[PDB]
């Protein structure tokens, strides 16, 4: 919900126009298995929900924001860098899972269209190219194992190459 | 939640801690580097009370002799 893209609206309605035979055997079984064990499992789920009654709140995810970046903290010091290294690592763990959501958005694009797939969508493939390219050039993907000090050097390497290209052109 | 109590330290620990261990570590590293810097200077020039070779005498004789 909300974060998931999902389909706009589901169609499909029963026609049953050609022939009689024995109607639709799948629809006849759909009404049969709805009361056979689908109704029994729904009654058992309702009985388990009623038996819960009192439940724990659980305050979900903790905040903890900013605490000064590694770029702001000039000169090497163990007391200052430690909290900056934790801040970068927490962002890197989130940025890994941001890609995974858009990855699952592309998974939804393949199924919910089926026949078209490549010809349609147009937004999910474009959003994937906007994030992955930003992830590849900024958040490691070339800077080996994760390090906060190496990321600042990687950001400076991209900035120096861009400034040399902009001044020439 | 039951595993969090009497079996786990918590996220508050090792965040307030470890940084305390790093604070001692920073003091241990900087002073050892200062010790390597001080011994590099004190051995080359005899300025401080470190690596100083013993002298001959402070006081031996001052009384009037039968000299020429």
Curated annotation (Swiss-Prot), chain A:
Protein localization: Mitochondrion inner membrane
Recorded superkingdom: Eukaryota
Protein function: Accessory subunit that is involved in the functional assembly of the mitochondrial respiratory chain complex I. Complex I has an NADH dehydrogenase activity with ubiquinone as an immediate electron acceptor and mediates the transfer of electrons from NADH to the respiratory chain.
Quaternary context: Complex I is composed of 45 different subunits. Interacts with CHCHD4.
Family, as annotated: Belongs to the complex I NDUFB10 subunit family.
Protein name stated in the entry: NADH dehydrogenase [ubiquinone] 1 beta subcomplex subunit 10
Full-protein interval shown: 77 to 143 of 176
Swiss-Prot record, chain B:
Localization annotation: Mitochondrion inner membrane
Domain of life where this protein originates: Eukaryota
Assembly and interaction partners: Complex I is composed of 45 different subunits.
Family: Belongs to the complex I NDUFB5 subunit family.
UniProt function note: Accessory subunit of the mitochondrial membrane respiratory chain NADH dehydrogenase (Complex I), that is believed not to be involved in catalysis. Complex I functions in the transfer of electrons from NADH to the respiratory chain. The immediate electron acceptor for the enzyme is believed to be ubiquinone.
Protein known as: NADH dehydrogenase [ubiquinone] 1 beta subcomplex subunit 5, mitochondrial
Organism for this UniProt entry: Bos taurus
Parent-protein residues present: 119 to 186 of 189
């Amino acid at each position: 919900x909300x974060x998931x893209x999902x389909x706009x609206x589901x169609x499909x309605x029963x026609x049953x126009x050609x022939x009689x035979x024995x109607x639709x055997x799948x629809x006849x079984x759909x009404x049969x298995x709805x009361x056979x064990x689908x109704x029994x499992x729904x009654x058992x789920x309702x009985x388990x929900x009623x038996x819960x009654x009192x439940x724990x709140x659980x305050x979900x995810x903790x905040x903890x924001x900013x605490x000064x970046x590694x770029x702001x903290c000039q000169e090497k010091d163990v007391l200052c860098m430690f909290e900056a290294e934790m801040q970068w690592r927490r962002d890197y763990k989130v940025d890994q899972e941001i890609v995974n959501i858009i990855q699952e958005r592309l998974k939804a694009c393949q199924q919910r269209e089926g026949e078209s797939h490549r010809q349609n969508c147009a937004k999910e493939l474009e959003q994937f190219t906007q994030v992955v390219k930003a992830y590849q050039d900024r958040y490691x993907x070339x800077x080996x194992x994760x390090x906060x000090x190496x990321x600042x050097x990687x950001x400076x390497x991209x900035x120096x190459x861009x400034x040399x290209x902009x001044x020439x052109x | 939640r039951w595993i969090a109590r009497t079996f786990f330290d918590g996220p508050e620990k090792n965040y307030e801690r470890t940084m305390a261990i790093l604070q001692i570590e920073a003091e241990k590293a900087e002073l050892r580097l200062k010790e390597l810097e001080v011994r590099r200077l004190m051995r080359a020039r005899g300025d401080g009370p470190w690596f100083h070779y013993p002298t001959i005498d402070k006081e031996l004789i001052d009384h009037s002799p039968k000299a020429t």
